[PDB]
């Protein structure tokens, strides 16, 4: 039974999310909660989040 | 039992942290960090951050 924590992949994932300008705080609120339920997942999060982040650029 | 959901101190709180000017990379991460684990204490978290920022002032 390993511990997975995903420390190093989470902390990233919310430090870059709270990083990135171009989303709206509902959206950054919505990538944080999908984050905190399923740490396992904040590599591809964080990737969706950068992808929703250049769809916003002005 | 009471669930206090910190979502809406821990976005304000972070993009107050991570927008300010005089801190370093290293300083902010460790704060997000401290704030994700106990999103509870925002507000002093917020007020340690913005002394340093203004300790640290060009």
Not at 13 to 31: G, K, S, T
Not at 32 to 57: G, I, T, Y
């Amino acid at each position: 039974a390993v511990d997975n924590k995903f420390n190093k992949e989470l902390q990233n994932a919310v430090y870059e999310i709270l990083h990135l300008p171009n989303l709206n705080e509902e959206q950054r609120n919505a990538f944080f909660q999908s984050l905190k339920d399923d740490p396992s997942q904040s590599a591809n999060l964080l990737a969706e989040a950068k992808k929703l982040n250049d769809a916003q650029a002005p």
